[PDB]
Amino acid sequence: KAGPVQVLIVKDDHSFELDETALNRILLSEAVRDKEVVAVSVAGAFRKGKSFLMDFMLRYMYNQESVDWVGDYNEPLTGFSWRGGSERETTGIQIWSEIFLINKPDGKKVAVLLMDTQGTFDSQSTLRDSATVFALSTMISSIQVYNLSQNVQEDDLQHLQLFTEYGRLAMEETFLKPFQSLIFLVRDWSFPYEFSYGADGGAKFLEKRLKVSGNQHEELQNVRKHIHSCFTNISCFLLPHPGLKVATNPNFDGKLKEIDDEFIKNLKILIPWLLSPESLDIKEINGNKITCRGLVEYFKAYIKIYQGEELPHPKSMLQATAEANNLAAVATAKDTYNKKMEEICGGDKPFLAPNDLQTKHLQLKEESVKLFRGVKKMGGEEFSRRYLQQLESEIDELYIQYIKHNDSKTIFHAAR
Amino acid sequence: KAGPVQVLIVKDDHSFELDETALNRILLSEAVRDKEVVAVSVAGAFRKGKSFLMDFMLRYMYNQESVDWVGDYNEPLTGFSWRGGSERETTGIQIWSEIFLINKPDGKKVAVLLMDTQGTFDSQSTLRDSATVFALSTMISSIQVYNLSQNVQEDDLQHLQLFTEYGRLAMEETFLKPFQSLIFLVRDWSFPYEFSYGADGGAKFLEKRLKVSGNQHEELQNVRKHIHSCFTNISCFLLPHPGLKVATNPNFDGKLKEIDDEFIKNLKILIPWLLSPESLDIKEINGNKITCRGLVEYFKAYIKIYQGEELPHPKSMLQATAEANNLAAVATAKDTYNKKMEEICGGDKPFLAPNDLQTKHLQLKEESVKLFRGVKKMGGEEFSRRYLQQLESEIDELYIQYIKHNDSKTIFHAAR
Ligand SMILES: Nc1nc2c(ncn2[C@@H]2O[C@H](COP(=O)(O)OP(=O)(O)NP(=O)(O)O)[C@@H](O)[C@H]2O)c(=O)[nH]1
Ligand SMILES: Nc1nc2c(ncn2[C@@H]2O[C@H](COP(=O)(O)OP(=O)(O)NP(=O)(O)O)[C@@H](O)[C@H]2O)c(=O)[nH]1
Ligand SMILES: [Mg+2]
Ligand SMILES: [Mg+2]
Numbered sequence: 093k094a095g096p097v098q099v100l101i102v103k104d105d106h107s108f109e110l111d112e113t114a115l116n117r118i119l120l121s122e123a124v125r126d127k128e129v130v131a132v133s134v135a136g137a138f139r140k141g142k143s144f145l146m147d148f149m150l151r152y153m154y155n156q157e158s159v160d161w162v163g164d165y166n167e168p169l170t171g172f173s174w175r176g177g178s179e180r181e182t183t184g185i186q187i188w189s190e191i192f193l194i195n196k197p198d199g200k201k202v203a204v205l206l207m208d209t210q211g212t213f214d215s216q217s218t219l220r221d222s223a224t225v226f227a228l229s230t231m232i233s234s235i236q237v238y239n240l241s242q243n244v245q246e247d248d249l250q251h252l253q254l255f256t257e258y259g260r261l262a263m264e265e266t267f268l269k270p271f272q273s274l275i276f277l278v279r280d281w282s283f284p285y286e287f288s289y290g291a292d293g294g295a296k297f298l299e300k301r302l303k304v305s306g307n308q309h310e311e312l313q314n315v316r317k318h319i320h321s322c323f324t325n326i327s328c329f330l331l332p333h334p335g336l337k338v339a340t341n342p343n344f345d346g347k348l349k350e351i352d353d354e355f356i357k358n359l360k361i362l363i364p365w366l367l368s369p370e371s372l373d374i375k376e377i378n379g380n381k382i383t384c385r386g387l388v389e390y391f392k393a394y395i396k397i398y399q400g401e402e403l404p405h406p407k408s409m410l411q412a413t414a415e416a417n418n419l420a421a422v423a424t425a426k427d428t429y430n431k432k433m434e435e436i437c438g439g440d441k442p443f444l445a446p447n448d449l450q451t452k453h454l455q456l457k458e459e460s461v462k463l464f465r466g467v468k469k470m471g472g473e474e475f476s477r478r479y480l481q482q483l484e485s486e487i488d489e490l491y492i493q494y495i496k497h498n499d500s501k502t503i504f505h506a507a508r
Numbered sequence: 509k510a511g512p513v514q515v516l517i518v519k520d521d522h523s524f525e526l527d528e529t530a531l532n533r534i535l536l537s538e539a540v541r542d543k544e545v546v547a548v549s550v551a552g553a554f555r556k557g558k559s560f561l562m563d564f565m566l567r568y569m570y571n572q573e574s575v576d577w578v579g580d581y582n583e584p585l586t587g588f589s590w591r592g593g594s595e596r597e598t599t600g601i602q603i604w605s606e607i608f609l610i611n612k613p614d615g616k617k618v619a620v621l622l623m624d625t626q627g628t629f630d631s632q633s634t635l636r637d638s639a640t641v642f643a644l645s646t647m648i649s650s651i652q653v654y655n656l657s658q659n660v661q662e663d664d665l666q667h668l669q670l671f672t673e674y675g676r677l678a679m680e681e682t683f684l685k686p687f688q689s690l691i692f693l694v695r696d697w698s699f700p701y702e703f704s705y706g707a708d709g710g711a712k713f714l715e716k717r718l719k720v721s722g723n724q725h726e727e728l729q730n731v732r733k734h735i736h737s738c739f740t741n742i743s744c745f746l747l748p749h750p751g752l753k754v755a756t757n758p759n760f761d762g763k764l765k766e767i768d769d770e771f772i773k774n775l776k777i778l779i780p781w782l783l784s785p786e787s788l789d790i791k792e793i794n795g796n797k798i799t800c801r802g803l804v805e806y807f808k809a810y811i812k813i814y815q816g817e818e819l820p821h822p823k824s825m826l827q828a829t830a831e832a833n834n835l836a837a838v839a840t841a842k843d844t845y846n847k848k849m850e851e852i853c854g855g856d857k858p859f860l861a862p863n864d865l866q867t868k869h870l871q872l873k874e875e876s877v878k879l880f881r882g883v884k885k886m887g888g889e890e891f892s893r894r895y896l897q898q899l900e901s902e903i904d905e906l907y908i909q910y911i912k913h914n915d916s917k918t919i920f921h922a923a924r
Contacts, residue, residue: 176701178713213661213663217662218727219727222662242555246629251825254824254886257886257888260888261886261887283756283758309634311635312632315824318826318887333756335752336749336752340749404833404885407825407828407829408670409670410670410673410731410734412828413822416831417820420835423838434909438909439912439914440915468819468820469820470673470674470820471734495855496855
């Protein structure tokens, strides 16, 4: 039987494991190992219908030849596990056990892999957990459907920038863009009168939101430039709300009869738009098309980097900004102390009596501390505590180095 | 005639102006100026129905004595300006021109003020813009309604942490908690079968979601502790979806007949739950009750700080993390160079011929530069560049100080 397979597992201690046995069983089988691969992923915030969408992609993948691939209207939606409720469902990364072999309009036979991912910003996950899942799914997929609710907000762009930057760090250097197709899929688009449901309205909507212009503030420009530089092809699809039954009914199990017809109409456009043979983007790494065996080799290698400690840790705004503020303030403070001591006992300055040098040092040290205490920082004195002690500990070291210099110039005259 | 008044203006260059004349005209009037004040605010992501909600608060405020204050089912919703479309409507902060005078059950007559705010994360706003509006509405309000769509995600908690932290920085030091009542208002709650609509289901949902435990990762703990430490009273209300007409219909103008009965039923509970006489939290700053007169003074004082450059700038995850990584790497790299030069030309060391010292310095500088280059940082080499040049420029300054120490020990012997 075909089924979902857990491939990347996120542990309770926030570490990550790759099930290589399971991965090899699927992608290294003789029928597919040497086929060029198309990898489709859906990712984004938790509880927003990723698995559900992905299960409709499955119906299409199996029954694409039929005009009614969308399914019997009384049949439940199965595959990757999905359900209602406010608690996250999908964890780590899972792939469908059956790799699809599809013929492209070029006579080419390709392997199609489907990837479902753990939602970002659930309440048991560190930012590192979420970033790793998102990054890994982006580096591996050739088509990434970035799933969003109702609108494309500035915080959505910021997250994407962060998560994709985390992906870039783990990759070999290239002048080419790191990734290929990105789709901003907007669920519950509420304004068809302004931008139509689907790809055309979506495209117009996205071009307005990702626009970079001369008078746009750099912070706004930069997050946008980052996204443009990452992906070869960027598109947007606006999907209508599927109706409150889909949203609210604890008994709903996916029967098309319970889904609003305008949603079904746009869904039938969306899936082939993603996944028809003419649309299947072959995975390229470093500008080279990759086979299923090669994809397994990049997957192992990338995971290894995220399991290690070479990468910087992803951090929240408060945490990262607090660190930045403190580090910068320690540097100014120390550097102020250091310039001033140079005027007292630099190499071109005379011997100073050690009692007087200690008095000037205490003066100068204190000025640097008061200087540091006085700079406002995220998040206040509490967070600063360990940095202030570092500042003092580091100034004392400089002072010790100055003492040695001063002592090498010592003058003593015997006198009654 | 009562109406909305623009009180805080955000300019196109991202600066802030207070309309004091307008503020004084409203809050310094002889009837209200000396009355203890209750300030109600709504804040959160743009396009989520903040103003719409507030206009229902206005209906309750005018008609609280009637059981049917919610209105005639054909009456359009007016007051603060609201509409559909994906582009933000409300900018800055506006207050209702009419201050409501209400008698509390203890016989006190208090003044009630309403605040509508510019939504966060729109595509024309810097993070500082958003942070400033949210912070200011929180510092001024005694009741802050934190408006969320569908769920409370880890990113929502993070935004709230940052924004409230930005507010604390502008405030006087105190052992008391900086703020009073916070309401997590969840719009379009989809799981009444799990947690009931309203305050009781919200309270249970929020206690699960804001819970701090021993085995929870510090990052999850810290965002929670911060929120507990900021607010005196924290509550949650789960609100049903108002129906797709309200969400989707460009002609909808607020008539209750077009709004789902379950939403209306719950709306009728929510507003008095927020704003009934027994519920009206009198504004306290530093543990002291504030009059309308006093509030205007704090509003002016806080604004000055946000107009200045005393505060740290709010930054995105990538911007702050990139800076932290770079600052930290420059300090290690410089510190490595510095220790090594100490073994060569500290005060306890012999004279070294300047040609040889230069050779040692170049060796050492290069080692520190590689050390810096080898550390992976967000986001890569481009961003690291201004820092690397600073690193080289700062090492050269150190070298210049060492040259002087060394020259002070010079040995020259004349010999044929
Ligand atoms: N409002 C809305 N709800 C949807 C939509 N599609 C699916 N849902 C509902 O979303 C709920 C969760 O779906 P699911 O696919 O499990 O979401 P997920 O993104 O995979 N969740 P997780 O990140 O926890 O795996 C279900 O009750 C489903 O009916 C949509 O377009 N809009
Ligand atoms: N889904 C949903 N839509 C709602 C709800 N309440 C109001 N709306 C719709 O949301 C839209 C925006 O309402 P509005 O009050 O202007 O929102 P806002 O949060 O003040 N927006 P802004 O930040 O741009 O000023 C309107 O079309 C309104 O009908 C709700 O609970 N759920
Ligand atoms: Mg899922
Ligand atoms: Mg508004």
